[PDB]
């Protein structure tokens, strides 16, 4: 089956391992270039193209 | 020789959201490429 | 307009064949 069926809509648990993701990306570049905070990471995701499109507008 | 039933058979699924996504993809690809097909 | 003579059939088939594939696979789901 598709991996997307491993997520249930409304489930309380997290569907991925943020520590594994951070342990991958902080070895891809280096440790402190990687977000260990999901809120900080999601803010950065929101902020970067919004600020760029504000500037070009 | 015998015609034995194959156990490796699996059902295929396409849910309704995937159908809507596929129909939208097909329609917008037609929108995009129709002018070039007509040239 | 002097368009390609195969443009209409190419456009209709290019839309219709994958539309048919998706409709076939969707309607049979749950079997």
């Amino acid at each position: 089956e598709s991996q997307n069926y491993g997520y249930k809509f409304g489930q309380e648990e997290e569907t991925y391992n943020i520590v594994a993701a951070h342990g991958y990306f902080g070895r891809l570049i280096f440790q402190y270039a990687s977000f260990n905070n999901s809120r900080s990471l999601h803010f950065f995701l929101g902020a970067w193209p919004v600020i760029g499109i504000w500037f070009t507008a | 020789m015998d015609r034995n039933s194959n156990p490796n058979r699996q059902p295929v699924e396409l849910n309704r959201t995937s159908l809507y996504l596929g129909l939208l993809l097909v329609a917008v690809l037609g929108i995009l490429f129709s002018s070039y097909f007509f040239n | 307009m002097q368009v390609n003579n195969l443009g209409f059939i190419a456009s209709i088939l290019f839309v219709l064949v994958p539309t048919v594939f998706l409709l076939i696979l969707f309607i049979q789901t749950g079997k």
Binding site: - | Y20, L24, G30 | -
Partner: peptide, 30 residues
């Protein structure tokens, strides 16, 4: 008559938008 084909593909896209909104798979908590 290429206008007929253009109107058809645009109408198909808009109809898919209508059916994807009004008759979506409803999200359910289970």
């Amino acid at each position: 008559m290429e206008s007929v084909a253009y109107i058809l593909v645009l109408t198909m896209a808009l109809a898919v938008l209508f059916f994807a909104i009004a008759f979506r798979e409803p999200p359910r908590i289970e």
